[PDB]
Amino acid sequence: PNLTEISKKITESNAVVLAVKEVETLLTSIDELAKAIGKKIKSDVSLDNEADHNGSLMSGAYLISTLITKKISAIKDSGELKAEIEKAKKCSEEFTAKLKGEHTDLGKEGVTDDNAKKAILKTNNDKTKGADELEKLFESVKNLSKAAKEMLTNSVKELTSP
Amino acid sequence: PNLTEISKKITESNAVVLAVKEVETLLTSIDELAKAIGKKIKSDVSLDNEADHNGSLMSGAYLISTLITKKISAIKDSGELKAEIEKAKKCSEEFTAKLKGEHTDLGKEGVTDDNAKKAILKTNNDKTKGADELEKLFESVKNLSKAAKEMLTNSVKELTSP
Ligand SMILES: [Zn+2]
Ligand SMILES: [Zn+2]
Ligand SMILES: [Zn+2]
Secondary structure, eight states: OOHHHHHHHHHHHHHHHHHHHHHHHHHHHHHHHHTTTTEEOOSSSSOEEOOSOOHHHHHHHHHHHHHHHHHHTTSOOOSTTHHHHHHHHHHHHHHHHHHHHTHHHHSSTTOOHHHHHHHHOTTOSOOTTTHHHHHHHHHHHHHHHHHHHHHHHHHHHTTTOO | OOHHHHHHHHHHHHHHHHHHHHHHHHHHHHHHHHTTTTEEOOSSSSOEEOOSOOHHHHHHHHHHHHHHHHHHHHOOOSSSSHHHHHHHHHHHHHHHHHHHHTHHHHSSTTOOHHHHHHHHOTTOSOOTTTHHHHHHHHHHHHHHHHHHHHHHHHHHHTTSOO
C-alpha cells in the first residue's frame, strides 16, 4: 500500500469530516437556543420563566442559520459528496428564507414562546415558521456526516487491509 | 512502522480532534449570538435595530456555555492533553459562573445592548459581565485545538517517516 497516497487521503478526508462537524455542531447550538425559549437566567443552574420575549434569541438563531450555509460551502469538494453537500446547502438556505419570511411574528422583541417554537423547536407539533426546514436540514447534514465519516474510515483501514 | 499500531493511533486522534472541534464550534456560535445583540429579524439579509431586549439571547448563550463544559468533560484523554483539557474545563466553568453572578442585569427580557456586550462580546471595551471569561475560554480552547491537531498530524507523519 502506497503510504504517500493513503496519508494524503486521510488528511484530506479528516479535513472534510471536521468541516461537516462544524455544520453539525452549529445545528446543535440552535437546538440549545430552542431550550432557552421563554426563559431567563436566574441565580441558579436552572433557568427561570419569562415568556414571549424571544426576539433577540431568534435573531441569534437566524445569524447562526446564515453561518451554517457559509460553512457548508466551505467543505472541500471532490464530487464524491457533491449530492450530499448540495442537498444540505439548499435546505440550509430554505431554513434561513423561512425565518426571514416569518419576520412579522419573529422580527420584534416580543416573539411569543409559541411562535419561537414553530421556528426552531424540531420536536414541536406546529413547525410552520421554520422548524420544518430545520428538521429536514438536520437529516441532510446527518446523511452528509455519515458519508464523510465513511470516506475517512475507509481511508484509514487501507493501512491494515486486507 | 507497525501500521496496525499507527492506524489505531490515527483513529483515536481523529476522535479527539472531532470532539475538540465540537467545543470550538460552540464557542463560534456564541460569537455569532453576540452579533445579534440589539437586533431583530426583517425581510433582508441584515438584521434591523431593536435595542435593549437581549434577555432571551443571553439565556441561549448561557445554555450553550453549560453545554460547552459538558462537551469538554466528555473528551477522551490518556494524559497527552491532560493539561489543555483541565484549563479549558475550568475556564468554561468560570464563564458560566460569571453569567449566573450577573443574573440581576442579565436575567430579564430587557437586558441592555451595553450589558449584553459586557457578557458575550469578547472584543468589547468593557468585559466585566462575562466577556473577559469568554475570551479566556476562547483562547484556552484554541490552545487545546492546536495540541490536538499536532497529536493527529504527527501520528499521520509516522506513515512517511522516518
Ligand atoms: Zn413580558
Ligand atoms: Zn424597547
Ligand atoms: Zn445575586
